[PDB]
Write a protein that binds this ligand. Structure first.
Ligand code: HEM
Ligand SMILES: O=C(NO)c1ccccc1O
Ligand code: NA
Length: 249
């Protein structure tokens, strides 16, 4: 929607296809899908529509951006991918990381998020502080996803469902544990667990709980808890948009 994707060479397209396969096997074996989804989303989620700065242009590999507190632990993800990236010198880091995020969702059983190549790596990381704060609520979520990224309220709730895989770590954010009973399985359980309340061994952030009390977010939580197909459709739409912020406009 509103996108005009660039032309890339046949050899570039060949590399995308081969890298997709290599990433599947690597991410599945290493059990790092959630960390790779977090990497891709943290790279993309810095987009500010007003200034057209940040976004999915490969800058998350820069030591300066990895040092942002919201990126605690993503240095591990960058290191894990570097040997594989080196097998695909023709690819931009931006394309590679966004492809890794799409693959992370696929190999855990989630929707097939469309992918288009051609992002060009940008020289300078954006300023720290654009990623969302786990202790804040719905006004903050709309500031970050809406006023900065330019995504919709539907996209906020669907993308929050990325917590359906993975966990927090007390040494990284300070929060601790998985949102779901099957942290390597991508399904609608994040919403089921959010709605059933606190269960021992499972995590809810204040930012997750904010979805339950908001008049626009709550009907979406309910929809996704009742209808995984609907969640998968809206998730794929939102993740594609996120992965393409500032790209091919
Ligand atoms: C809605 C606002 C969000 C907030 C406040 C938030 C906050 C957090 C926090 C505090 C952690 C734990 C980090 C750690 O301690 O390891 C985390 C992890 C994670 N986030 Fe988010 N997040 C948000 C949105 C998203 C989005 C949009 C996605 C992707 C679609 C996402 C994907 C993930 C994943 C997969 C993990 C698990 C990482 C792992 O298992 O190592 N999050 N998030
Ligand atoms: O990993 C995160 N989000 O996915 C995250 C981690 C720490 C602080 C804020 C955040 O948004
Ligand atoms: Na899960």
């Amino acid at each position: 929607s509103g996108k005009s994707y660039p032309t890339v060479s046949a050899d570039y397209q060949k590399a995308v296809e081969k890298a997709k396969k290599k990433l599947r096997g690597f991410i599945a074996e290493k059990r790092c899908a959630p960390l790779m989804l977090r990497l891709a989303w943290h790279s993309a989620g810095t987009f500010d529509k007003g200034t057209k700065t940040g976004g999915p242009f490969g800058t998350i590999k820069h030591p300066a951006e990895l040092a942002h507190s919201a990126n605690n632990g993503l240095d591990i993800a960058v290191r894990l991918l570097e040997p594989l990236k080196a097998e695909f010198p023709i690819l931009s880091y931006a394309d590679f990381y966004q492809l890794a995020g799409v693959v992370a969702v696929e190999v855990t059983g989630g929707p097939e998020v469309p992918f288009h190549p051609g992002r060009e790596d940008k020289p300078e990381p954006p300023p720290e502080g654009r990623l969302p704060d786990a202790t804040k609520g719905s006004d903050h979520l709309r500031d970050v996803f809406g006023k900065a990224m330019g995504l919709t309220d539907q996209d906020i709730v669907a993308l929050s469902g990325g917590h359906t895989i993975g966990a927090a770590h007390k040494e990284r954010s300070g929060f601790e544990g998985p949102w779901t009973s099957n942290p390597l399985i991508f399904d609608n359980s994040y919403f089921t667990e959010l709605l059933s309340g606190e269960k021992e061994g499972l995590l809810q952030l204040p930012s997750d709980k904010a979805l339950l009390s908001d008049p626009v977010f709550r009907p979406l939580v309910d929809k996704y808890a009742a209808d995984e197909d609907a969640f998968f459709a809206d998730y794929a739409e939102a993740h594609q948009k996120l992965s393409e912020l500032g790209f091919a406009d």
